Write a protein that binds this ligand. Sequence first.
Ligand SMILES: [Mg+2]
Ligand SMILES: [Mg+2]
Lengths: 140, 155, 59
Amino acid sequence: LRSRVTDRYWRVQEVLKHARHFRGRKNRCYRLAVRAVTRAFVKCTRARRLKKRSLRTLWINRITAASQEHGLKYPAFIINLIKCQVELNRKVLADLAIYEPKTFKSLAALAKRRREEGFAAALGDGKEPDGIFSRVVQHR
Amino acid sequence: VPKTSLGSPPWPDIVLPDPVEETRHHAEVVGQVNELIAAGRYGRLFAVVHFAGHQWKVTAEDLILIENELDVACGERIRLEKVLLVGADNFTLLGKPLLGKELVRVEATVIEKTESWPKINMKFQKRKNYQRKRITVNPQTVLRINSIEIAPCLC
Amino acid sequence: SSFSKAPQQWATFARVWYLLDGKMQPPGKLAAMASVKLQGLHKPVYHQLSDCGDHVVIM
Ligand SMILES: [Mg+2]
Ligand SMILES: [Mg+2]
């Protein structure tokens, strides 16, 4: 009972589906296609991992620029926003930086205020005064 | 103590207001914004929401895509609870680190329950003869956001 | 805040000429900020694939 593979056409089609937009001979010849397609998928999955650090880099830059406009550097801005107990994404923060410049300058004013409060608190060398923005709320 | 380029600390001097005047000024400012809320002068609100492990920026009539399945009938009206920011042209409310329920309310509708487009994930190794190809399909949920309401009570 | 679409587009991505006076400055510290402004890295709308970046005139 001799058997041959009749459906070889669709087997090839399934790997050429992905190969159509490649340059040169990879979009035709089944060898070249197979290899370039495996390459393509591997870089696909690595890109999934990268694109999270890329987007986060982008965000940090935009936050840095927005912060620079108001004369405050990136680390200062972020730390002080945190020490005020305001937890905001860098995604949400960069979006505020572009599409709501007013609110964002409000934030930068807040952070700057909180920081000067910090310098004054630590240089003052006494334990008593709580700057109005230095109090810490425990939730109920 | 004459002036040399060092003996003077290199930064503007810090001017910090008295706590009393600040308590008065805060009571007053909050009072005023409160009068704006009562008046109804806020044109359009935008909120920063925390949902399903992410933060989002949301306004009425908008749309977002949540990455997992929620158990809700299609078309039901959800009330989102943890709210980080609320803002409007003239004023902004900031939560530490959350906005109280009685203050603001944001109501959305679930539009679409979907399975995501196939995501192709493949591990490979040089001349170890190791390949693994796996295609992923993720349940997704689209939300229409209906309304952001803001109540007068602020003290 | 309410502009037509074409003019909003134009206003956002406008190229802005900067003047920077040089006399008695370390050429490195000069090139630091000169480069930042050149590249568009002061604009919150910045992205690598956008053409955005501004003229710089050093005198
Ligand atoms: Mg036969
Ligand atoms: Mg992960």
